[PDB]
Amino acid sequence: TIRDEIAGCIEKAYEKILFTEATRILFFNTPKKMTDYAKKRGWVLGPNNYYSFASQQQKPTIPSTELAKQVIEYARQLEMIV
Amino acid sequence: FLDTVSTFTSYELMDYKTFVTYTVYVSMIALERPDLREKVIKGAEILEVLHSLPAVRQYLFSLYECRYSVFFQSLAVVEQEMKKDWLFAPHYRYYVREMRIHAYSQLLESYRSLTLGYMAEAFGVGVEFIDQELSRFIAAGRLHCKIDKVNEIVETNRPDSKNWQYQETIKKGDLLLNRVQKLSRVINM
Amino acid sequence: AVQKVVVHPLVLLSVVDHFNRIGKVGNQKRVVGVLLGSWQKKVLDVSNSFAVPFDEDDKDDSVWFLDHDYLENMYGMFKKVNARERIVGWYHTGPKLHKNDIAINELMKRYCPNSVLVIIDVKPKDLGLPTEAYISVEEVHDDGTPTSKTFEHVTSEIGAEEAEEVGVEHLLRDIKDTTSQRITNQVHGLKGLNSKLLDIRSYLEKVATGKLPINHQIIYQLQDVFNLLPLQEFVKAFYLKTNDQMVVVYLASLIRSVVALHNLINNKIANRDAEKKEG
Amino acid sequence: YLHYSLYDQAEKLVSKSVFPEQANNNEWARYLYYTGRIKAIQLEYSEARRTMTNALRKAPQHTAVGFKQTVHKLLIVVELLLGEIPDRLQFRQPSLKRSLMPYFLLTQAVRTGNLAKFNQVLDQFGEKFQADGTYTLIIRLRHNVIKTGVRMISLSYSRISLADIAQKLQLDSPEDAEFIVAKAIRDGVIEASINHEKGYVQSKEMIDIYSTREPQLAFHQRISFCLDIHNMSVKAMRF
Amino acid sequence: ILDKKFHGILDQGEGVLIIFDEPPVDKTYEAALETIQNMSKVVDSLYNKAKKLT
Amino acid sequence: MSEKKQPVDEDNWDDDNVEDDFSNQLRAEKHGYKMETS
Amino acid sequence: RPANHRQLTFEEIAKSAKITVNEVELLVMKALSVGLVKGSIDEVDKRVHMTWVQPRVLDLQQIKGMKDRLEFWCTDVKSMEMLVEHQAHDILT
Numbered sequence: 001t002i003r004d005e006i007a008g009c010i011e012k013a014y015e016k017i018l019f020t021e022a023t024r025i026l027f028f029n030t031p032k033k034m035t036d037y038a039k040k041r042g043w044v045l046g047p048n049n050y051y052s053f054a055s056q057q058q059k060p061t062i063p064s065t066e067l068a069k070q071v072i073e074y075a076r077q078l079e080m081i082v
Numbered sequence: 083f084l085d086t087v088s089t090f091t092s093y094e095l096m097d098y099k100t101f102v103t104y105t106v107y108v109s110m111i112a113l114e115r116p117d118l119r120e121k122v123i124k125g126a127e128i129l130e131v132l133h134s135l136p137a138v139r140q141y142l143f144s145l146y147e148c149r150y151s152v153f154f155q156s157l158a159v160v161e162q163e164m165k166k167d168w169l170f171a172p173h174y175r176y177y178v179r180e181m182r183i184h185a186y187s188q189l190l191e192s193y194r195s196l197t198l199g200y201m202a203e204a205f206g207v208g209v210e211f212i213d214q215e216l217s218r219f220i221a222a223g224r225l226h227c228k229i230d231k232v233n234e235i236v237e238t239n240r241p242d243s244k245n246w247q248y249q250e251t252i253k254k255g256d257l258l259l260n261r262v263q264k265l266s267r268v269i270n271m
Numbered sequence: 272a273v274q275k276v277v278v279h280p281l282v283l284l285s286v287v288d289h290f291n292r293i294g295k296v297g298n299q300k301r302v303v304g305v306l307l308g309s310w311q312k313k314v315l316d317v318s319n320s321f322a323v324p325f326d327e328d329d330k331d332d333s334v335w336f337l338d339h340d341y342l343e344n345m346y347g348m349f350k351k352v353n354a355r356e357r358i359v360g361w362y363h364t365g366p367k368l369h370k371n372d373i374a375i376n377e378l379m380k381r382y383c384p385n386s387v388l389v390i391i392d393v394k395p396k397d398l399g400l401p402t403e404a405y406i407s408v409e410e411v412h413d414d415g416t417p418t419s420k421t422f423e424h425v426t427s428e429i430g431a432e433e434a435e436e437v438g439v440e441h442l443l444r445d446i447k448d449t450t451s452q453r454i455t456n457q458v459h460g461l462k463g464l465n466s467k468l469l470d471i472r473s474y475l476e477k478v479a480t481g482k483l484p485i486n487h488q489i490i491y492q493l494q495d496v497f498n499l500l501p502l503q504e505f506v507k508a509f510y511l512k513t514n515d516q517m518v519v520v521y522l523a524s525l526i527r528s529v530v531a532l533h534n535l536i537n538n539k540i541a542n543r544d545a546e547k548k549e550g
Numbered sequence: 551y552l553h554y555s556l557y558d559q560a561e562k563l564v565s566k567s568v569f570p571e572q573a574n575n576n577e578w579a580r581y582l583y584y585t586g587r588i589k590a591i592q593l594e595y596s597e598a599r600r601t602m603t604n605a606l607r608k609a610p611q612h613t614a615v616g617f618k619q620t621v622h623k624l625l626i627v628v629e630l631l632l633g634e635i636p637d638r639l640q641f642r643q644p645s646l647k648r649s650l651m652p653y654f655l656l657t658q659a660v661r662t663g664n665l666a667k668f669n670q671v672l673d674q675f676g677e678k679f680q681a682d683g684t685y686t687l688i689i690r691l692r693h694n695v696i697k698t699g700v701r702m703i704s705l706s707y708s709r710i711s712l713a714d715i716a717q718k719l720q721l722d723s724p725e726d727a728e729f730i731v732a733k734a735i736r737d738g739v740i741e742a743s744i745n746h747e748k749g750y751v752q753s754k755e756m757i758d759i760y761s762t763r764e765p766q767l768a769f770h771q772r773i774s775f776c777l778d779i780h781n782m783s784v785k786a787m788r789f
Numbered sequence: 790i791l792d793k794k795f796h797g798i799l800d801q802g803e804g805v806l807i808i809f810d811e812p813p814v815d816k817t818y819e820a821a822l823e824t825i826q827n828m829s830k831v832v833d834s835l836y837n838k839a840k841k842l843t
Numbered sequence: 844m845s846e847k848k849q850p851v852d853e854d855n856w857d858d859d860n861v862e863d864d865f866s867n868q869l870r871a872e873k874h875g876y877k878m879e880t881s
Numbered sequence: 882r883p884a885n886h887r888q889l890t891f892e893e894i895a896k897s898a899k900i901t902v903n904e905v906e907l908l909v910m911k912a913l914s915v916g917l918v919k920g921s922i923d924e925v926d927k928r929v930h931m932t933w934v935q936p937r938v939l940d941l942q943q944i945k946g947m948k949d950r951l952e953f954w955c956t957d958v959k960s961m962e963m964l965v966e967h968q969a970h971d972i973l974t
Contacts, residue, residue: 008736009732009733009735009736012732012735012736013735013741013742013743014743014744014746015743015744015745015746015752016746017746018746021746024725025728061506061509062509063513063763064509064512064513064516067516067763067766067767067770068965069964069965069968070770072965072968072969073968073969074770074773074774075969075972076968076969076971076972077774077777078527078777079972079974080972080974081777081780081781081784082784115791115792116792148791158874158875161871165871169854172854172855172858172862173854173855173857173858173862175858175861175862175865175870175871176858176861176865179865179868188791191790191791192790192791192799193798193799193800193801193806194798194800195800195801195802195803196800196801196802197801197802200801206877206878207877207878207880207881208877211874211877214868215868217702217703217706218867218868220705220706221702221706222864228708228755228757229707230707230708230709230710231707231710231714232709232710232711233708233709235708238798239757243812243814243817243818244761245761245765247814247817247818247821248521248524248525248765248817248821249765250821250825251524251525251528251821251824252524252528252772254824254825254828255528255531255532255776255824255828256772256775258532258828258831258832259531259532259535259776259779260607261835262535262536262539262831262835262838263779263782264607264608265835265838265839266535266539266543266783266786266838267575267786268575268610269539269542269543269546269547269786269838269842270546270786270789271571271572271573271574271575453966453969453972453973456962456965456966457962457966460958460959460962460963460966461959461962463958464955464956464958464959464962467951467952467954467955468955470951470955471948471951471952471955474944474945474947474951475945475948477944478941478944478945485941485944486938486939486941486944490944491936491937491938491939492936494936494947495935495936497950498933498934498936499933501883502885504885504887513762513763514762516762516763516766517762517763517765517766518816519766520765520766520769521766521816521817522816523766523769523773524765524766524769524772524773525816525820525821525824526820527773527776528772528773528776528824529820529823529824529827531773531776531777531779531780532824532827532828532831534780534783535779535780535783535831536830536831536834538783538787539783539786539787539838540834540837540838540841541787542783542786542787542789543838543841543842544841546789547841547842548841576844576846580847610844611844613844614844614845615845616852617844617845617847617849617850617852618845618849619849619852620849620851620852621847621848621849636860636864637860637863637864639859639860646852649852658863658866661863661864661866661867662867
């Protein structure tokens with residue numbers, strides 16, 4: 001529960017880490033287990049370098065029509081009542 | 083104390099100059115810049131008499147041009163003064179830091195891409211001073227603005243007609259809404 | 272050139288009763304008669320008109336019978352009654368047309384310099400508006416052949432020149448001042464939709480069996496006014512509408528919370544009064 | 551189940567049938583208070599403080615002398631555990647003052663970031679803390695002090711350093727400040743990341759977050775709540 | 790700027806001043822203040838209610 | 844009412860909440876001595 | 882191209898229109914004098930923006946295959962009309 005919470009909390013909203021912050025927060029300098037992390041979570045093992053992705057957030061465009069349906073049932077509930 | 087035509091001298095007026103003291107120690111706060119100039123500047127009736135106490139007068143004069151160096155000089159001065167003045171001993175704490183935050187409000191309101199260090203001169207050597215000061219002041223929930231240490235920002239922000247002028251709406255139409263709700267609940271249960 | 276005339280439903284009722292006439296006297300099918308009007312401007316009034324005793328032979332639509340004693344003669348007796356609503360045009364029933372309409376209107380062109388024929392509806396079943404007017408037109412082609420006179424859609428609308436609903440209103444006995452939006456919505460939608468269905472079927476015919484008017488003169492600019500927005504990527508309009516709905520929901524929120532408080536206060540006042548002060 | 555050992559709150563978690571007409575209008579208030587103490591002692595901040603708030607504003611009257619007072623001392627323990635509470639003095643009965651001689655200095659220890667005072671209020675008033683009998687407050691109140699620090703200073707500066715806040719609150723090393731900032735991202739207050747060479751936070755505040763379509767998301771709940779109370783006043787006008 | 794003689798933002802970090810002001814919102818000001826007064830009126834009516842109750 | 848277990852139990856007063864909020868900032872010279880520190 | 886990116890770059894213009902960067906501006910100001918297209922052409926990115934145009938003469942294959950816009954319009958605005966009415970169905974009233 002140290003290591004899988006590292007799997008969560010290694011770049012939650014970080015810029016980037018390197019080999020040495022892996023060596024600090026992780027332990028056991030390099031097994032095939034942090035290599036397994038880099039080949040198991042959908043990870044880019046950069047050049048002695050780390051990134052969550054190329055954008056880290058999967059890039060987060062219509063707020064109108066769903067709230068228009070909301071207006072439909074909203075006016076509907078304002079109807080039938082006085 | 084807006085009379086100034088009916089408190090010349092009386093057995094109630096321990097000193098009309100002390101009348102001026104009590105007046106300014108509430109007018110440098112009550113009087114917004116328009117009311118400031120209205121009563122202090124425009125109202126030259128008190129000036130013909132406050133000609134006798136020019137320290138806080140010139141403080142108020144800077145209180146328009148916003149000269150923060152002499153602001154802090156006279157700020158220390160008036161701080162000691164209130165520290166040694168009646169009916170203020172257990173309460174005078176806020177007035178000075180209030181003057182501080184209020185002046186910083188307009189000063190930042192000047193524009194945004196500005197620094198406290200550029201004003202640290204006006205702050206005296208006020209980098210660390212205002213560091214802890216404004217840290218605890220924004221911590222005191224004051225003066226929406228932006229400022230850094232590695233960047234030393236300044237900001238002009240907080241428009242009421244952005245959301246707050248629309249947030250008061252529910253702030254009250256829910257407070258009173260549920261007020262009358264429970265009030266109109268026990269009418270039946 | 273006419274954008275609108277007063278389509279006064281009194282002349283509508285005249286048309287309807289004389290259609291009942293042509294139906295009950297026998298088998299004369301196409302109701303055809305003379306439209307009378309007073310040219311005030313490009314705008315006009317149609318409140319008075321009449322049907323002329325006429326017959327159309329099955330073949331050679333250019334068969335007609337316009338008595339001068341039932342028109343020219345009547346016009347003089349009608350001239351002493353009211354000279355305003357002059358001889359202005361005529362009309363025909365039957366949805367599309369027959370071949371004579373042009374010759375008839377051009378015969379009567381001597382009477383009215385801008386004479387009109389109107390495809391009149393004998394059965395109100397339309398999605399929208401009944402019979403419309405078609406004045407003399409010179410619209411031949413880019414080819415510009417000998418000038419065809421198939422009278423174009425000279426737009427107009429149902430003009431109620433005066434109220435006179437002292438009886439007309441007294442006939443409805445059905446409706447109120449609809450404080451209805453949903454009616455408008457369903458009508459508008461389904462009408463746009465069936466119109467577009469007529470469109471797509473017409474154009475499938477154009478591709479299949481349609482004539483040279485396949486893209487005659489505007490059908491492409493028809494598609495251009497369609498090309499007004501040719502997902503349309505209204506992203507400018509998207510954040511535009513974002514602020515618009517800021518306004519919309521500010522309206523909704525503020526106004527309807529006002530409404531809430533409004534009914535709340537006094538409705539509860541009367542409620543509690545009649546509730547506990549009754550016992 | 552409150553006065554004795556705590557085994558059968560799973561019974562309310564499996565058999566939640568707790569919804570009458572809420573007739574006596576104070577029974578429901580103190581009922582929500584007691585189950586707020588339940589969710590306070592299970593684990594909750596948000597839902598527990600909102601049902602404590604609803605029972606607080608659903609105090610029926612003050613026609614019964616000083617009975618809101620001890621029960622309110624135990625009510626806003628979770629608001630003390632928020633860390634975003636000022637001094638609570640508007641509630642204070644003057645006959646409650648001699649019993650809140652611990653509790654006044656306790657909310658003062660909430661406003662202060664001192665560590666020796668954080669444990670010296672405990673060393674001074676552990677017997678009244680046993681009169682409370684809630685260890686849940688002190689098992690997270692140190693964490694509340696560091697979250698008060700992170701909320702204040704992370705709302706304060708855009709690109710602060712972890713060393714500034716760290717050796718401003720006596721952390722003495724970069725890596726436990728890293729674990730603080732990391733568990734604060736995990737607890738989700740601010741964006742603040744690390745310019746990873748030896749720490750040295752690179753971060754930002756968040757204005758220009760959103761302000762127009764997002765209010766009108768909540769305005770559905772505003773006015774749908776209003777129309778609910780409309781129809782409730784209708785069904786109350788029925789009486 | 791402090792006295793509405795000027796409305797906009799100056800600069801020294803960029804040395805580039807920018808002017809702006811678009812205050813008037815009759816919707817927000819008007820409606821919101823009217824609602825504030827409505828809240829006061831409801832506060833008033835609260836006592837009529839509490840009286841006719843008991 | 845208090846039908847529960849609980850039956851077991853401006854001069855500066857106005858400015859007092861701020862005072863305890865002022866209880867962490869230089870309560871009332873080092874401000875002015877900072878002038879000559881530089 | 883019916884699609885968006887109607888803030889087109891000048892690149893296809895200067896490639897296939899046998900024109901240069903200094904003359905795309907004349908290429909569309911002479912078209913402003915013509916009056917069949919009146920773009921709001923970008924000049925910080927040098928992009929030749931597309932507004933309303935005068936489209937074609939005949940696309941008989943697209944007079945047949947305009948169904949993907951016409952019947953698209955018909956059945957989809959019809960269906961969403963039915964959906965708005967179907968969510969506000971029983972306030973027929």
